[PDB]
Amino acid sequence: QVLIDTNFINFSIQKKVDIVRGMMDCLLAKCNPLITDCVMAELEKLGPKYRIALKLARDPRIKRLSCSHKGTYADDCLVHRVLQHKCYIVATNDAGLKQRIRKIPGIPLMSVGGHAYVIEKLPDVF
Amino acid sequence: DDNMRREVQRDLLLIKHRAALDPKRHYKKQRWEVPERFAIGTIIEDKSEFYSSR
Amino acid sequence: ARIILTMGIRSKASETDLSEILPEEIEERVKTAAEVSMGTEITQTDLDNINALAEQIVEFAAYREQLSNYLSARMKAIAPNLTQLVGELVGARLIAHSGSLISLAKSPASTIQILGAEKALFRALKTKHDTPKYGLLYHASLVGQATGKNKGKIARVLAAKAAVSLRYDALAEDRDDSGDIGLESRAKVENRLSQLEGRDLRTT
Amino acid sequence: PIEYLLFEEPTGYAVFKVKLQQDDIGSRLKEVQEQINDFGAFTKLIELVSFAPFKGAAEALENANDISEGLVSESLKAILDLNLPKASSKKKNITLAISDKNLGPSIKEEFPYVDCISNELAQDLIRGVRLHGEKLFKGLQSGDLERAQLGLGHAYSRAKVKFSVQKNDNHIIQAIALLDQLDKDINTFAMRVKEWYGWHFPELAKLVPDNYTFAKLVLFIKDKADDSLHDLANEDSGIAQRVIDNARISSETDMENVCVFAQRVASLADYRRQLYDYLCEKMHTVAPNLSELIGEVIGARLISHAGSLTNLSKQAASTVQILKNKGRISRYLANKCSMASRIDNYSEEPSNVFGSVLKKQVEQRLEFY
Amino acid sequence: NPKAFPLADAALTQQILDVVQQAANLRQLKKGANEATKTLNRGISEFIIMAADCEPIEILLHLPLLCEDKNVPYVFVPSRVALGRACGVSRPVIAASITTNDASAIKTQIYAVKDKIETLL
Amino acid sequence: TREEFVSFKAHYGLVTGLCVTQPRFHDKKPDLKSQNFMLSCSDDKTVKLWSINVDDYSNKNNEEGLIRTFDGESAFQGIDSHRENSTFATGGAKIHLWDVNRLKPVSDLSWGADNITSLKFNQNETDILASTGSDNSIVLYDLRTNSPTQKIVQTMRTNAICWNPMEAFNFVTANEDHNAYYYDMRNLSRSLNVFKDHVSAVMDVDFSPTGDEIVTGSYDKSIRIYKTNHGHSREIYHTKRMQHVFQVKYSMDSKYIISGSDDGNVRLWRSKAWERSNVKTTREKN
Amino acid sequence: GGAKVVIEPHRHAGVYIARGKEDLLVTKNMAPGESVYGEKRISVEEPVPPTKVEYRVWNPFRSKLAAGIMGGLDELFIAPGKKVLYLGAASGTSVSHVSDVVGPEGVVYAVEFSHRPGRELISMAKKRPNIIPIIEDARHPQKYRMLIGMVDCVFADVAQPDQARIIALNSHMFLKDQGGVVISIKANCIDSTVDAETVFAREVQKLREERIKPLEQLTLEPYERDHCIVVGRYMRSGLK
RNA sequence: AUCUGUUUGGUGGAACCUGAUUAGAGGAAACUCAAAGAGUGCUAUGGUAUGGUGACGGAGUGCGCUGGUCAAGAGUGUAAAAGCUUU
RNA sequence: GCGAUGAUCACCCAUGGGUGGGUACAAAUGGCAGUCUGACAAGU
RNA sequence: GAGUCCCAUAACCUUUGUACCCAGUGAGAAA
Ligand SMILES: [Zn+2]
């Protein structure tokens, strides 16, 4: 189960990768993608330029969590809920969030690179 | 009172310096100053199982 | 024991009352606890053993108080001046501590003061500490009347007069079993206790 | 509209009248969620109109079971028929707020003009009156509500589990733990009786060594006598009258006192063996298989040292302390006795037949050797 | 509800008895009632099988209370004779226990039977 | 709880209208204490009527969706249900009247051959309909005479109507020049108010159930609340996340305002922003 | 076995540590003179003469709550005057320790559904009067809503997959606002197809969906493999 | 032992260095006087305040209202029905 | 004419004794084990 | 002047009399 954020969705649509099919042929496993309410709040706050990205995040195949905090800082929410539990893949393309996630141990990181998704800290990919 | 602390004042030193009683025991590093309220008590092993902790 | 012999059961308590036991203010508490309770309901075949145990310990206390009557009688017929001074069971465990009445009579009054507190005494002598001041004589009624450091003081004067009366009782031959020497010694101790409870360390 | 409220509680039933509705749409908000914690604002919502108390713990347990399994009892019918207005059954029913969605159908089966609500609004109204409790009732109930709660919880649980006080092994625990105490009490008290009568003649404790028999015969002999006919309960009685003729030891008040002491010893001696008969009977009704196998007093001490019939049952068979061939009959009797105690504990009203079969098995095993 | 309540039907009974036979070959089965209660109070047990037709029934009904205390699955097979035959010994057994082991070659089978009897229970 | 009882893939196109009913069938009896009923028209030429399992009373203990399917030959654009007598009306290529028993329109009540974009029934005097046609027209219909009644042509297109629930002949129109018009049914020659403060086309209007103020959401991504006697906005609600508020209702509490935007979200607002919804002691109420 | 220890109060109120050469988690004994499940006891003579009061050793391999205490929990809500609703009082093993931590002035409602554990619960609640045994299913709190009112902490040692619904129902009925919610989650008994961190994350998400704010979780690993205690408080308004 | 000189424990606290604080650092008393903080308790209850300024009250009548029952109407259904619905 | 409802597992002599180590109970005018100080104080 | 109410009403040791010994395991046993 993979936590998505907003620039990962934007780079997915910019590189024409499907979310669940890109995840499946990246990991060769069955993926459950998760949009937290703060990532969804960030996509809605991005305005009416990003309508395509918002209604591709509105997808019944993409399940969605319910964050319980004030504010819509998705990087704080993703970092907290991943270092609490260590049962999550983080799909992101922010340089700062990528550095945070790859500094906390045991957390695999997925990112749009080239024309498909790549995964780094998951040691069983083939 | 100090009258009873002057009777249990030696085994409180033994519990403070636990770490050098057996050369194989190796406790976790606490300090353990003497607590303000304590009580000295004796273990009742019951009359159910014999010969093991007896 | 007397109350479970009286009522037995909780509904039986709801229909009965009692005043010769449990005086006048625990009745509403036992009735409220009889009305609401986390207790089960017993049968007759074990209520019978409950009742047998209750009458057993009632008769036990009857035997206790009549043995105390026997002790008071033998004590005021054997060493009556000690009974008039320090009391029946206190003088009784003095005599029973030291063995014989003559063996208690030939001991000094300081020994009769500290007579019960031997382990405190001898640890406070074998290291150089302060000795006790009460011993077995602490439970006399006069030392009960005293308060402060003067219960040590009248433990001392009570042991002195008790040595006087005790060796009179053990060593007299024309003794009359009437409490005369013990009674005049008790009057001496009582007015001494009066004159050192009249003083006060405050300044008026 | 949530017009009335029904709160069930161990002291009785309460019907409240809802004064002000709480918010429906803003029901998850912070101020609406903590107005039921503040009492000064909860009393703006709820007013007590009726409280029918119970007739006692019997009707309390009846209504606790009826409320538990979702039925309208007769006291419920009485208080609802007193308090709720005769509304229509086809147009604008009166609205009662309950906390039990399967008690609702039983309320509409009896009063068709009552629609019942237990959703989150009725739930937090109900937990508001649960949170405040004794303050809403304005002083009108007998009995503290938590004390009635303790009584009703214990009664409900023992009813639901069918707790019988006949098959209650704590009786036989306390019976044998008291019987050992009075064994040593009759022993030391009759030892002092023999000591105090030892200087009246020191041969009665030589001829008659049993404590009760010595004490009962010295309760009536206090002298010489001759007339040795009712002292046989007669070779020992004849020897005793011969020793009274050849008296060879030394009052009145002291002798009256040791008569009272021997009467005490006799009273202890026949309260014992009343207790022993009681615990053999209680052991036959509580553990018949154990008492068939190894006897009533032995089974009593076995479940006492185990702590309970349940602890002796759930103990392993190789860890039972019962009291070569002589070494392994103990192990055979141990695992058969553990088997018998399991039968006896977990059967609900036990028979004796499996204790009989295990007794037959262990006698066959000992007769084989 | 009888005393020997969570009885298994025939398919679950044969699944249970097959994994009992394999654990008995792999030395992971402690068989008999007091060995079962020994390994139960020691905590090395994954599920206990009681047979619901021995000559008393409380003789092994002492074990559901122990399993409930320590949260261990327990299941009632309706044949002590078939249970002993699956255990691989020449006598009927009335209770058996699958001890825990992680160097065990049948751990997936034991876990599947545990899940089946726990959804039963 | 802010959570859906049920969802329904109702149609294939846009669901262009939906309302709610208490369907007066004369063979069955409506169970309104456990079922709710909503019906809904779309541009795939269908009106569908659905039932919903509702947990509001605990009287009972069930075949929820799509109890019937009305069918038209052209598309539909609006729908509103009569507040009695099993009747509703659907606007579209032409405005038809329907009842929930018959599977076909009872009557076609169209002024001319110009289509109808919106519809509202009256709330008291329940037999007076009003509709907005794309020829910038507002038409009143009466259901005693089973006929249209009077129409007016305005400058731009009326997006919505709502009737005053407390005055029974007044309604408010919400139209494409950026303001709302408060009209009297007995004299449509003049508006009796104009509510002016919007800056793009007004998409939807609604009345408070107290009849004293209106809410008004528009194509500039903001909603506005107006006192009925003034004619300028008492309040504006906006959000960076809210885009193009297309639907606004005023909840029956008269205290909350439901807005449906076009990013997907339906949002609750307070009608009075500074007003909290706890119950109040008399000192704070005073 | 006959040795001497020193009793010392823990950080948590109502529980103690007996220091020797191995130190023991220890509680005061509400029913002095007998052991409940065969634990060992400590008898101090505290100073009419001094009275022999005694203490019971809390075994972390037979108690999830003691495993949590001596793994280190920042806040238990079981406290010496409180009311605890124990769910899944599977015998009197941990309920006795919770009972005498809570003390004579506080109440433990021990809810259990099976009947032979209920019989042992009632015979234990005789000698511990501050235990109200409730033999009922916790999945239907209305069946015993009449016997319990306004608890301060719920403890949940149920081992069922509908755990979070049971905890939520009992909390919404009987827990007060900002009261304690202590959960012992067993991963394998919830579900074994996913890993332990997935099921703990899902259970914590279920708790905050039923508005119980989690403060703290602890894996309690040397005593139980793939267990957890989640300590939360019943926020009821504003987890934010 | 006019042997020994290490360890443990108490007393003592130079020089350097580090940290904190500074109208030097405290201490004792209380049915003392003030300044503030936190928690708890208490029906803490007018959602628009008594049944009534002879302008009023009470009694009775008439209208109004509530419930069930029966009858009639109407719809729907049907060979006829029955049933069901009915602001 | 078996069994998991459990098989199995200190010194001296040509079943019986001799010699003692631990267990509990009770006793002891057995032991530890030795019964404080000694002339001022209170008041006016 | 002065440490008992905190088991000298006691604790431990020694000797003397009375009753015993010197649990786990887990598939074998018999011929
Ligand atoms: Zn978030």
mmCIF file of N, CA and C and ligand atoms in Angstrom, chain A residues 38 67 69 77, ligand 1:
data_model
loop_
_atom_site.group_PDB
_atom_site.id
_atom_site.type_symbol
_atom_site.label_atom_id
_atom_site.label_comp_id
_atom_site.label_asym_id
_atom_site.label_seq_id
_atom_site.Cartn_x
_atom_site.Cartn_y
_atom_site.Cartn_z
ATOM 1 N N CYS A 38 -5.134 15.298 3.122
ATOM 2 C CA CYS A 38 -4.301 16.474 2.947
ATOM 3 C C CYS A 38 -3.702 16.538 1.549
ATOM 4 N N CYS A 67 -6.865 11.697 7.344
ATOM 5 C CA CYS A 67 -5.934 12.317 8.261
ATOM 6 C C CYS A 67 -6.679 13.203 9.247
ATOM 7 N N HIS A 69 -5.752 16.078 11.558
ATOM 8 C CA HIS A 69 -4.908 17.154 12.044
ATOM 9 C C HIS A 69 -5.415 18.440 11.424
ATOM 10 N N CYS A 77 2.232 15.141 7.074
ATOM 11 C CA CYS A 77 1.315 14.036 7.341
ATOM 12 C C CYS A 77 1.872 12.706 6.855
HETATM 13 ZN ZN ZN K 1 -3.117 14.385 6.191
#
